[PDB]
Each structure stands twice: as structure tokens, then as C-alpha cells.
From a paper:
As a key mitochondrial Ca2+ transporter, NCLX regulates intracellular Ca2+ signalling and vital mitochondrial processes. Here we report the cryogenic electron microscopy (cryo-EM) structures of rat NCLX in cytosol-facing (intermembrane space) and matrix-facing conformations, with and without Ca2+. Each NCLX protomer contains twelve transmembrane helices and two sets of helical hairpins/bundles roughly parallel to the membrane. The structure comprises a transport domain, which mediates NCLX trimer formation at the centre, and a gate domain, located on the periphery without contacting other protomers.
Residue numbers in the entry:
A (entry chain B), B (entry chain A), C (entry chain C): 50 to 254, 300 to 582
Write the structure that this text describes.
């Protein structure tokens, strides 16, 4: 019954027996068993190969998550938002917020679902908070000096500090009960209402050819125009976006036809329910048999092909039907399931690396999960600042993290409480590194709250350079205390 | 004979017996016994109420100190200074310096008078030094870029570093003997002489209506003009300044009549000696009886009313007599006694909070005493910079702390040695937080000494932002080591 | 057989017996025995005098090293470089690099030659790296904003980071074997080749009167023109440069006659071989007798005077002979031997101070050796920036440290391996301060690598102020952990 963190203190011939009958480290969900693979699929000689290969697979999964969220998830959420006839700011605080922060939220939802990994979620949430408010905001001001917006800044910084200190309290007590989770969700509702009300009160005051081009991930002219590095990224993510364009339908509101592609969409109307049944709960309910008479994948593919022929006959190949926002909805679902599968694999990899090297969940979440999840927003915000709109970038910077922390903790803990039939989610402490992380986030927030108003909201290079120096120093201190030079 | 820091390890029914016969924490001065009140006047259920109420009382006492020093003490010192026909710079380095730094000096004088509290004085002096040279000077440069004055800066920084390192030596040896205290006062005399000589060598090279308006603390037009927050502060300090205008006489040199208010002043000529006899040594001498025939408060009120009628008859209600600078002197005395009473109460509150929560004198004096004492200069210096005179603000910033440390340690230790009949004041060490505070002050001074000349005395936003970041980090480290995450 | 760090725990009457028969601290090179002197030449009463005197002697030796390198070593290297008809950039990366970094390299060569002192070399190399990339580069940007050169910066920063991480690996393994040393030298060769190839591909894309004036170290007009401080430095280094001008010949390429001074040079053609034989290995091979018939100093002085008369007769007193670049070579040798003697004395002083005060080699090399060695580079680079060429200063800043670390570790360890007949140089760890130093250098490099490109290579005051603050904080942390307040 030994904890399988004790697998590196065994004779190398008996690590198979341990890994294959110790139940302490069996992935809660997923497809690949990374720890049987790392220990006795590869020969003990070449352990560094297994770990280098796992790190490259982690990086490619982060690319998968970013590409899926930016190009397929968020436009479908926007299609639904426009279909419901909402304004710009309510949309940008609810639907576009969900779309922009998808990777963090799904990562927290997966980590909170298992007692052994719940320390990854806390580390990743606080670490992403520390990273976005120092490196991204600072870099935005270094790239371009601008005059920041007062009211969004003060609103966002105040709400974020309240949410953060509430989470420190929950960490200290050592638990999250469903009253606390419902409190997180209630605070989010109050934030959306205050944004709406403040912005209102201040405003008043041949088929086959089009199928082949539809499935074609790449355009000749742009690819011939970009540099070498952009070509390299495009060829890196070509398989990802081929599977995406093949299996998720995207409704786009700016277009005249609204990306209506009659053969492609009427074929995904068969392809996508199969992806749902195979991906939901990693397939257990997919292969489950009802009654022993009608198999499950068979019935879903049969009904899918029936209704795909039904819609193919009923529509012509020029003008969309009157109800393809349901294509928007169906695309939302299967984009969400793709993100869920990628996040489950990422969390399993990080857990296995923690078992092998006897690392802590806090440092793994603090560094690798946080950076991998924040690469997307960093890229988006820096591009927006360089184009000539740094007010928008600095606003979105502080606007995203509130949604992330609040919805992530709320939903993740609530769903764990519901499926587990428990009354609380225990937050066991991983040493005293969690309090170093907490104090780093706290002081960062305090520095921004004092500095930006005192500059009269005129931000420049000095502010960003100070924040960048602070982040480098914090990371060095974390690494030095994790590996045992400075012990607390 | 147990130390009453051991009162929180007793059965809650026996905390009365301890607090009322343990002599370890029977404070030797003041009016209110905060520790009997916190333990068994309030029911043990609602201890947080007692402490919230004590924190609000601390804040109001800091407001009392600031209002009394700025409006009543310093103008009387200036009235005496002008009456003696002094120049601007000698006055600004002696009399106006005393007036501007009153709260720090009286706080140190009170803390040094008791072996159990002498750690508050060291913490407060070093902490105010760290705060003024990072947050106030930095904020001055952030608000407005300017070209600093070379000679005042170099003079002040050199003198301050000598005084600070001398105090580190005294701390290391663990004592202050009266030779050291007289040395502090001698260094102050040398500093004043060098300022005089350098500035010279570089320059050469119905009655009732006026009584009611005299007692009226508030003016209609200004109050109607200010915002909500200023109205709130005015109504907060109306009782304070009513008692002040009632009991301390102010002679003002710019006015044509020199705030001569015949009925008000000839009535304070009775009111003020009573305040002196009731406030001196918290009243022990006041109620003491001489000979058993003539009571003390009676004789002072009798002589006061006699001489008040005598001066009322002898003067007319338009032109001051030829000797009301004696009103300036009498106002100086009773302003000083008000400040002494407020500082005694503040020190007793901090000591009680240290006993209850088992905190150290160093951290309490490092933060609460230092911030409460420095709010005044912060406000004055930031207003001066925003008005368009940041050279003056940056000069006064480094000019005040020399007076504070030098006169505070000198006088406080000298008076304790005199009343105690001892030969030294023992400086017992409160752990290794005092050396963290010492090194923070040292590095702050070294950074300013290198940076300002290297910029060619052209100061801007980057300097101040670096200093602000350093102060936030230092406070976080102090809090983290006090509460036990990082132990030394 | 006790370690003589245990000499301060003995009765003061028996410290002579220990110091004169303990072989643990009998230094194996140099002229003065600093530890016999500090313990029982001076009376035990006045130990502070011995140490103050030793600190002044250390400072004067650092001045000796700087004056010898800048005025006598480097011009001779340049004379050889021009004589071989090289271009500007190859010369500036090989010969002028050697000349500019002489003190660091000779210091490392001396420290690595003894197991007891090899910790001084690591500390000094890493500490000089930390100092040059924070204080010198930062000060250059504070003095003058400029647009930095991209390609030199990126080349230099990349090569330096590779060299530094390679040395951390060698430190972790605990050894340097001659394969590693040859690897250091091979990396240096690759760096020189890449600089050459990149710059090429981007470019294509009465006798007695002249003798007395020759020996005259001082000029009247300049000395009458400078200030008091410059006069003080000139009189401080007059004896140094008198011995230098007397015993080392300098060939200078800009001059019309090329500093050809017929009597002075034909006399140094006797004087200099004597200095070589007396300075090489501190004189052991000098006084060694061959055969017992011809003494060594006698034969060298005899042959020297013979060939000096021979060259005096053969040449006239106006035009140089056709081969005085051999004077350049002979001057190179004896300048190198002067630098070697001064560096040996400096290392012996630091070792004795470590034994007396029980300090570590890491902190001694981190601060005193690093600062003393880098004063020259800082003076040269700050003067160059103030004159109006800050691109050149910022280039030389990062270009010097690569040569320093790479050639210093390579040659020092290689020569120790060769003379010792061993297979490796053991790098024993002095606690956990070496890892604090390593992490400081690492983060500094990372900050510069991120910040400078992000600013678009437009450098100003904010960058330098951040770097200066970081260096002050790092030094305070080092001092606080060495003296035991913060223990790791």
C-alpha cells in the first residue's frame, strides 16, 4: 500500500510489479498510461529519452489547446452571443471571456476532480495570476506608452483582490464547502451586473470543389508571404487544424454566407456526435451497452447519417437554412470536449513527472501549467499593443484573470462536490511554498494598485521593467527553495 | 511572577486574576488600562470587537497628533523664532524642524522611558527612516520630474548615514550610556552649525461676537466648496480642533493683529495652567497635596483667574499688548503636553496588542508607529510637489529624518538615564528582525547615494518606481518572517 | 596537524609556535609572509593596525595592476598585433581582449594553482560577471541614452550564457578534468572564428637629456592643469610608473619614431632579463646554481651588458633599427611577470584574511577580488560613454567577460593539471553561497536578454536603475547570509 512516490527506491527489476499493482497512481481519466510507459516500456538505460519525449508532447498539447480555443471555440461562442442580440460589453464580459480563458478553466476543472492533483489547480491559478499581472501588463507598457483607462482598471483590480484574499482564506481553513463555491459563482454574477450597470450609466451620462477547399487548412499566398518561422508554426499545426476543420463546425458572424459549407457541415452532422460519445468520460459510457440489443456507437452513427441525408435533401447549396446557429451550438460542444481531452492529458503528464522526480504539485502548477496556459493571451495582447491599441490590451489583461479564478474555482469545486457526493474539497498543504506564491501575488497586486493611479494613469517603460525584474526574482526564489538550497 | 505574555495560556475564567495582580504589564503612565479592558470588561465571546475598537482609537489618536502638531505647535514655534529675529534657514533647521517632527520625537521619548517598550522606539525610528527615503522621496519624483539641489542632498545624506551607523554600533554593543547620548546631541549641534556656515559662505560667494467667531472651528464657504471626502475629514476633526482652539493660544506672525483675540486669550490664560497641571505626569503631581492647607488645582485656578482679570482690565480690545509672545510660549507648552498625552496612549495600545497576540516590539514599531507618525510629512510633501515646488519637498524629505533620529535618541535616552538614576539604557535584542530592518535602511541609503549623482541630479519616474517596489518587497519579507514562514 | 583556521582558538602566547610549524598555511609563492606578520610581529594589542595596513596594501596593489595593464601591457600587445598586420575586429577580440582583461586572468591563474584557494577563483569570476552586467552596463545607460547594436549584443549574450551554464555543470559534478579545460579553450577558438566570419560577411554584404626626459614620469603642464584629486592620484602612482618606465620597454604604433629612446631601451636590454629571472617562480630558479661554476644572475647580467653594448654601437640615436618589435615582445613578457607578482600578493593577502576572520573563499573572491579587478573596466567604459560613444562602451562591456571566464578557467585549470601531474582539479563546495551567486548571475543574464530586445534596443535610464537596485540587494543578501543572520 506504499505511496508510489516510493517507486524510485526499489530495485529496477521490480518497478513493473509496483507500477502495475500499486493503485495509488492510476490516472483518474485519459488514454495513455504515462507511468507504465516511463518505467518499463522503455529500457532503464534511456530514461532521459522518455522524459524529453514527454516534454515535447506537453508542448504540442499546449499548442493544441491554444489553436482549438482561439479559432474554433471562441468564434462559436460569439456566434451564439450575436444570435442572442447582445451588446459589446456584456458579450465581452461573459461569452468572449469564457472563450478567451477556456484552457485555464478546463485545466482547473480536471485538476480539482482528484484529491491527489488538487494542488496543481491552486498552483496554476495563482501562478497564472502572478504571470499575467507582471510580465504581460509590464510588457504592454514597455512596447508602447499610453494613457490607461481609470474606471476599468479600478473596477478590475478591486474585484480581483477580493477574490484572491477569499481564496487565501479558503486555503488557510483547509477546505472548500459548496457554500463557498456558490459564493464564488455569486460574486461572478455580481461582477457582470456591475459592469453592465456602470457602462450603461456612463454611456447615458460543383459541390466537391467547395468541399475540398473547405477541408483545405492552408492558403498558398499567405504561406508564400510569411517568413521561415511562421511557415514552421503553420506546418506544426497543420494536423491539428485538419482534425479540427474536419470534426467541429464553425459559424462566423462577419461573413456574408456565415461559413456555410453545405457538404462539410452536413457531414460533420454525422462526424461530431461520434466524437462526443467517444470523448465523453474517455469512452466508458460510449462502449457501455444498453439492453444488449442496440449498440451505442451504432445507434448514434445511424441516427446521424439519417438526419444528415435528411438535411442534405432539404437544403440547397447556396443559402444557409434558417437555423444554423444550432451548428454554432454543436460546434461549441465538440470544441469543449476536445479541450477537455487535451487538459486531461496535460494533467496526467504533470502528475507522472511529479511522481518520478518527487516534485510538488505547487511548483509544477506554478511554472509549467501556468506558462502553457498563458502563452495564448500573451501573444494576443502583445500583438494588440504593437498594432496601436494598448488601452484594449491592458484592459483585457486584468479583465481575464477575474473570470479565470472565479469561474475556475467555483465550477471545479462544485462539480467535484456533486460527483463525489462529498461535502467539501480538502485543500491539503504542500509545504510552505504555497504561502510564498500567495505573498508574491499579493504584493504584485498592491504595487499595481499604488503605482498606476500615482502616475496619473500614464504608463511607460519604467513600470514594466520593474514588474519584469520582480517576476524573474520570484521564479529564482521558487526554484531555489524547491530544490533545497533555501529550506523553510 | 510569570510574564504576562503568558496570559493567553490560561483558563478564560482566570484571566482577570492574572491581569489584576500580575505587575509585569501594569503600565506606568496614561489614563486608560487597555489590557484589563480587553480581557475581562468585554465578554470573551467578542474579543474581535475590542481589537477593532482599539484600532479605530489608534487611528483617531494619530489624527489628533497630526492636527495638533501642524496647526498649533509649529506656528507657535515660528512665532518664537520670528520674535527672536532669525533668518530663514537657521529657523528651518532648528525650530521648524522641531515642529515638523514632533510626533516621532515624543513617541521615542515615551517609548524609551520603560525597559519593556524600548524596542518600539528603535523599530519606529528605523522604520520611519526606511519609509521616508523610499515611498515619500520616490513619490515626489513620480509626481513631477525636477532637477534636485546638489549641496543640500549631499550634506543631508552624509549626516544621516553617519547617525544611522552610529546607532547600529550602539545596538550591537547592546547599550546606550550617557556619553553616547551627549554625543548624539553634539552631532546635532555640529549639523546646525555646518548648515548655517555653508549657507552663509555660499550666499556671500461687541466682545461676545468675536469670542464666538474665535471659538468657531469651521468656515461656511470653504466647507460648502470642498468635496465629500474633505467634508468627512473636517467633521472627523471638529471635536479635536474645538478642544485645541479652546485650550491652546496661537500667535501667528503673518497676520496684522497676530491672532490677538482679547476674550479668548484672556480666558485661556486661566484654562491652560489647569491643563498643564492635569496632564503633567498624568496628574500625580496635580492631585498631590502640599502642606494639607492649600490644594493644588485650587491655587492654580485662583492665581489664573486673578491674573486673567488683571490683564483683561489693563488692555483694550483692538491692539495687542507689547508682550504676547509670552502667549506664544504658553501655547508651545500646552501643545507639547497634548502631544505627550496622545503619544503615551498610542504606546500603551501598541504594548497591549503585543502582549495579546505575542507580537514583537520591532514589527509593531516598524509598521504601525512608523506609518502613523509619517502620514503628516507624506501629505505635506506630496501637496508641495503637486503645487509646483518639488525641490523644496525633496529637500525637506531628507532634512527631517536627521533631526528625528538624532534628537529622538539623544533626548529620550538622556531623560531616561536622568530619571532612572542609571548609567545606561539596555537595548535587548528582539530576535534577528532588527538586523533585517537595519540592512534595509542601509541599502536604501546606499542606492540613493549612488543613483542621484549618477543621474546628474535629474530625477524622474524610474527612480521613484524602483524605490516603491523595494519598499513593498521589504514589508512582505518582514511579515513573512514575523509570522513564521521564513525563520532565521 | 590542525587546520590553521584553528589558530584563533589558542592562547595568544602560543600563536607563534602554531603559525611557524603548522604547514597548512605556509603559502607556496610570494615574497611576504602575511600571517606570521599579522600574528606575532605586531603585538597582540594592535591587531586592527595590521589589518588596516593590509587593506591599504591591497588597494595599492590593485592600483599597480591597473596601471601596469593599461599603460604598458596592452600597448605592447597592440604593437605586436599591428606588426602582424591584422584588422581591427580580430585584433580587438584577441590581443586587445587579452590586454584589457589581464588582471582577472592572472588572478584566476594564481588562485587555481593551490587546492586551498581555488574557491577564490570561482567566486571572483562569477562576481565580476555579476558586477559588469549590472553596474557597468546599467551605469552606461544612465549616463547617456543610446540605440544599442543588435548583432554584437545577441552574439555576446548567447556565448556568455553557454559558458556560464557549462561552468555550473562543472561545479555540480565537483571537478574539472583536462577534457573540460580543452573544451573551454575550443569554445574560445570557435567564438573568435564566428566574430571574424560574421563581421566579414556583413561587411561584404645630447643623449643624456633625452634619457632624463625618457625616465621622467610626469609632465608639468597637464599636472598644473588638473584638479586636486587628479594630482593626488598622479602622486600616488608616480613610484609605480617610475619602476615601470625604468624596467619595461614600450613600442607604440601611432608615434612617428614609435617611442624609440636609444639610451633607455638599450639599458632596459640589460635591466629586463634580470627582472625576469628574479620574478619567475619568485626567484627559486633564479638563485638555483647550475654546475657550481657560473652563477645565474651573473651570466644573465653579463650577456645582457654584452649585447646592450653591441646594439648601442650598431645603431644611431635618431632612427629605430629594423627589428624593435622584439622590444615589443620583451616588454610583453616583463609586463606579464609584473602582473603575476602583484596577483600572487593579492591572493596571499585574501587567504590570510580568510584564515584570521574565518571567512569563506567565495565571499572574499565575490567582493574584494571582483571589485579590485573591475575598477579599470568601469573607469574606461564610463569615460567612453561620457565622451559620446556609448555604443562602443556597451559592446566592450559584454565582450570582455566572455574572454575573462573562458580563457581564465581554461588556462588556469590546464596549467594546474600540467604542473600537478593530476587528472582533475577538485572544486570543493564552500557551503550554499556559491549557488546564490550562480542564481544571481543567471537571472541578471536572463533579465538583460529579455529586456534589451523588447525595448527595441533603445536603452535609457530605467533599465540601468533597475540593474543597480538589483546589485545592491544581492550584495546585502550575501553579507547577511555570510555573517549568519540568514542561514541556509
Amino acid at each position: 500500500m506504499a505511496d508510489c512516490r516510493a517507486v524510485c527506491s526499489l530495485n529496477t527489476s521490480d518497478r513493473c510489479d509496483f507500477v502495475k499493482r500499486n493503485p495509488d497512481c492510476h490516472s483518474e481519466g485519459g488514454y495513455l498510461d504515462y507511468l507504465k510507459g516511463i518505467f518499463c516500456y522503455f529500457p532503464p538505460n534511456l530514461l532521459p529519452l522518455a522524459i524529453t519525449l514527454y516534454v515535447f508532447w506537453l508542448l504540442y498539447l499546449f499548442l493544441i489547446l491554444g489553436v482549438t480555443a482561439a479559432k474554433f471555440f471562441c468564434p462559436n461562442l460569439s456566434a451564439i452571443s450575436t444570435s442572442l442580440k447582445l451588446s459589446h460589453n456584456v458579450a465581452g464580459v461573459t461569452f468572449l471571456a469564457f472563450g478567451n480563458g477556456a484552457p485555464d478553466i478546463f485545466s482547473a476543472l480536471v485538476a480539482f476532480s482528484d484529491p491527489r492533483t488538487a494542488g496543481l489547480a491552486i498552483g496554476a491559478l495563482f501562478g497564472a495570476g502572478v504571470l499575467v499581472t507582471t510580465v504581460v501588463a509590464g510588457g504592454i507598457t514597455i512596447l508602447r506608452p499610453f494613457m490607461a483607462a481609470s474606471r476599468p482598471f479600478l473596477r478590475d483590480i478591486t474585484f480581483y483582490m477580493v477574490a484572491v484574499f477569499l481564496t487565501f482564506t479558503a486555503l488557510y481553513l483547509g477546505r472548500i464547502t459548496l457554500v463557498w463555491a456558490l459564493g464564488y459563482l455569486g460574486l461572478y454574477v455580481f461582477y457582470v451586473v456591475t459592469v453592465i450597470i456602470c457602462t450603461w450609466v456612463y454611456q447615458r451620462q460543383t459541390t466537391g470543389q467547395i468541399l475540398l477547399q473547405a477541408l483545405n487548412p492552408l492558403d498558398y499566398r499567405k504561406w508564400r508571404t510569411q517568413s521561415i518561422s511562421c511557415k514552421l508554426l503553420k506546418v506544426a499545426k497543420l494536423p491539428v487544424e485538419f482534425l479540427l476543420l474536419l470534426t467541429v463546425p464553425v459559424v462566423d458572424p462577419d461573413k456574408d454566407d456565415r461559413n456555410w459549407k453545405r457538404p462539410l457541415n452536413c457531414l460533420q452532422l454525422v462526424i461530431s456526435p461520434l466524437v462526443l460519445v467517444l470523448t465523453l468520460q474517455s469512452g466508458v459510457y460510449g462502449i457501455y451497452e444498453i439492453g444488449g440489443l442496440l449498440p451505442v456507437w451504432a445507434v448514434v452513427v445511424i441516427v446521424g447519417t439519417a438526419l444528415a441525408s435528411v438535411t442534405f435533401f432539404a437544403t440547397s447549396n447556396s443559402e444557409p437554412p434558417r437555423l444554423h446557429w444550432l451548428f454554432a451550438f454543436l460546434g461549441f460542444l465538440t470544441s469543449a470536449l476536445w479541450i477537455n481531452a487535451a487538459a486531461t492529458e496535460v494533467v496526467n503528464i504533470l502528475r507522472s513527472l511529479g511522481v518520478v522526480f518527487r516534485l510538488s504539485n505547487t511548483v509544477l502548477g506554478l511554472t509549467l501549467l501556468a506558462w502553457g496556459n498563458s502563452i495564448g493571451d500573451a501573444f494576443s495582447d502583445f500583438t494588440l499593443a504593437r498594432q496601436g491599441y494598448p488601452r484594449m490590451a491592458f484592459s483585457a489583461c486584468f479583465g481575464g484573470i477575474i473570470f479565470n479564478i472565479l469561474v475556475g474555482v467555483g465550477l471545479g469545486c462544485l462539480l467535484q462536490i456533486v460527483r463525489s457526493h462529498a461535502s467539501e474539497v480538502k485543500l491539503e498543504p504542500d509545504g510552505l511554498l504555497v504561502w510564498v506564491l500567495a505573498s508574491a501575488l499579493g504584493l504584485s497586486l498592491v504595487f499595481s494598485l499604488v503605482s498606476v493611479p500615482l502616475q496619473c494613469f500614464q504608463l511607460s517603460k519604467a513600470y514594466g521593467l520593474c514588474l519584469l525584474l520582480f517576476y524573474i526574482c520570484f521564479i529564482v526564489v521558487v526554484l531555489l527553495t524547491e530544490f533545497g538550497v533555501i529550506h523553510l
